[PDB]
């Protein structure tokens, strides 16, 4: 679920998902079009694609379980949708951690008109 993803993001990065990642660049929190602005925005682009691989799942609301094996995120077995959603979220949280070194506050509340053109998954 979106709330669980937000908690995962905070655990991983020390940033609150809202507002650090809820309106960032062209793809974080409301992705759709444009060239991603930086590596963090590319995490969101890929995460959006990942959810796109699951048209008959409901990633905003469906809850999954996971645990930590010494820092590592381990998705625990639920329904097929839950497992796949968890793997998408895990990847994005890791990606955000890997790209904290270039996170830029200038991309928070990034305006829609600067995000043009479709980029295929």
């Amino acid at each position: 679920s979106l709330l669980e993803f937000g908690k995962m993001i905070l655990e991983e990065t020390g940033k609150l998902a809202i507002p650090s990642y809820s309106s960032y660049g062209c793809y974080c929190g409301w992705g759709g079009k444009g060239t991603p602005k930086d590596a963090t925005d590319r995490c969101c682009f890929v995460h959006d694609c990942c959810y796109g691989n699951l048209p008959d799942c409901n990633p905003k609301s469906d809850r999954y379980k996971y645990k930590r094996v010494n820092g590592a995120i381990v998705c625990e077995k639920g329904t097929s949708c839950e497992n796949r959603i968890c793997e998408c979220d895990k990847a994005a949280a890791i990606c955000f951690r890997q790209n904290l070194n270039t996170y830029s506050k200038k991309y928070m509340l990034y305006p829609d008109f600067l995000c043009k053109g479709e980029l295929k998954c």
Binding site: G32, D48, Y51, G52, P55, C57, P59
Partner: peptide, 4 residues
Amino acid sequence: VARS
């Protein structure tokens, strides 16, 4: 719901 996927992202697009």
